[PDB]
Amino acid sequence: GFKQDIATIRGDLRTYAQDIFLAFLNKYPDERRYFKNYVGKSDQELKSMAKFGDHTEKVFNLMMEVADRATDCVPLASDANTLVQMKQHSSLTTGNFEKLFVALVEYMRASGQSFDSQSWDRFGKNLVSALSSAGMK
Amino acid sequence: GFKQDIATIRGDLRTYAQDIFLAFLNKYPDERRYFKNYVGKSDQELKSMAKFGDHTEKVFNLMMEVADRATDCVPLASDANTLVQMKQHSSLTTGNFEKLFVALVEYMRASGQSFDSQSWDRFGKNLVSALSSAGMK
Ligand code: HEM
Ligand code: HEM
Ligand SMILES: Oc1ccc(I)cc1
Ligand SMILES: Oc1ccc(I)cc1
């Protein structure tokens, strides 16, 4: 289930993080406008950029912590507040997060691993609801 | 064949019981709802809970007794009845049992080991038939 999925991702985090983030960017190419220097590059080009791996790993490090601190796929209010208040997230709306979790869930469903994709969908929705409660537009 | 598979499983009953049960919960995550104590725990956390190892082994011990008492993968009517009348199974249907056997068969096929998976599938089918006759919804 969900808790074991956290351990699974953590066991091979950089690989999962890059693959999920690439799934997100490829499904939603216009989301690249939030990032510098990602446009005009193939998956393999991005994976060789030193910033790409390091930053995607940091995102998913924190995403896994938020998932881990959750109860029944409900994140902590303080974790949601952190995500809203981060300067790097100042221009974002909940829709950006919805798209990320659509891509993540689709990746899990298409994978050869036994992810509890429904729980990740629930977590994504609960996170969006928490982001809204915390004041994200 | 089937008789040897019983010997293989019995030889390391705790490991097989835990592995097959987790394969079941992973393939059918909604089934975890029946095990309120296992909700939101990692596989490793589960393995450290006395009742997880104890009760899972006891489940598979009984499964092996039913298996061994069968003739050509046809279980005894009395064994089917035991499973239906158990208080712990009061809210279950034959669908819960088919799911378990689907996961068990997939586990066997995915292992490198020479399980008689076809026989286990047939045993599952025959047991489900016997459960319905014994009154299971
Ligand atoms: C639960 C989901 C998310 C988590 C846990 C998260 C977390 C983080 C973290 C920890 C960083 C710092 C990375 C670093 O400095 O190396 C970061 C940066 C950033 N994030 Fe988020 N983030 C999430 C979702 C999103 C989404 C959906 C977007 C936009 C579609 C986004 C846009 C950005 C941007 C533009 C930066 C700074 C630029 C960059 O790192 O390349 N984040 N995020
Ligand atoms: C042939 C298949 C099965 C056998 C032989 C079997 C046998 C057993 C046994 C011996 C116990 C008592 C364990 C103990 O208290 O130590 C038990 C309990 C229980 N079983 Fe079944 N079972 C089977 C299938 C299922 C299925 C498919 C479900 C539903 C997903 C289920 C749900 C439960 C629950 C909720 C308990 C109570 C918790 C526990 O004491 O383990 N069982 N079963
Ligand atoms: O650097 C990154 C990578 C992925 C995400 I989602 C946000 C920022
Ligand atoms: O305690 C348990 C474990 C596995 C099963 I299947 C039923 C009850």
Residue keyed to tokens 């279950």: B92
Fold observed for domain B1-137: Globin-like (1.10.490)
Amino acid identity, residue A15?
Answer: T
Contact between A3 and B32 using a beta-carbon 8 Å cutoff: no
Structure solved via = X-ray
Mutation for testing the A interface, residue in B28, B32, B38, B42 having most A CBs under 10 Å: B42
Whether residue B137 is annotated as binding a ligand: the answer is no
- Phi/psi zone of residue A136: left (φ > 0), alpha (ψ -120 to 50 degrees), beta? beta
- Residues of chain B positioned with their CB less than 8 A from the CB of A123: none
The 10 Å Cβ neighbour count of residue A115 is: 21
> Which residues are B74's β-sheet partners?
B71
User: CA-to-CA distance for B53 and B43, rounded, in angstroms?
Assistant: 11
Q: Using alpha carbons, list the distances in angstroms from residue A96 to A22, A127, B74.
A: 15, 12, 55
The Cα angle at residue B97 between residues B93 and B103, in degrees rounded to 5: 145
**Residue A71: φ, ψ to 5°:** -120, 130
**Cited resolution, angstroms:** 1.8
A74 contact B CB<8A: no
Per-residue b or e along B92-123, where b marks 16 or more CB atoms closer than 10 Å to that residue's CB: bebebbebbbbbbbbbbeeeeeebbbebbbbb
User: CA-to-CA distance for B37 and A62, rounded, in angstroms?
Assistant: 27
Tokens of A24: 């997100």
Give the start-to-end residue ranges of the domains of chain B. 1-137
- Residues of chain A positioned with their CB less than 8 A from the CB of B42: 3-4, 6-7
Residues with CB under 6 A from ligand 4: B 21, 55-56, 59, 100
Per-residue b or e along B3-24, where b marks 16 or more CB atoms closer than 10 Å to that residue's CB: eebbeebeeebeebbbebbbbb
Contacts of A55 (CB under 8 A, 6+ apart): none
- Phi/psi zone of residue A58: left (φ > 0), alpha (ψ -120 to 50 degrees), beta? alpha
With beta carbons less than 8 A apart as the criterion, state whether B137 and B94 touch.
yes
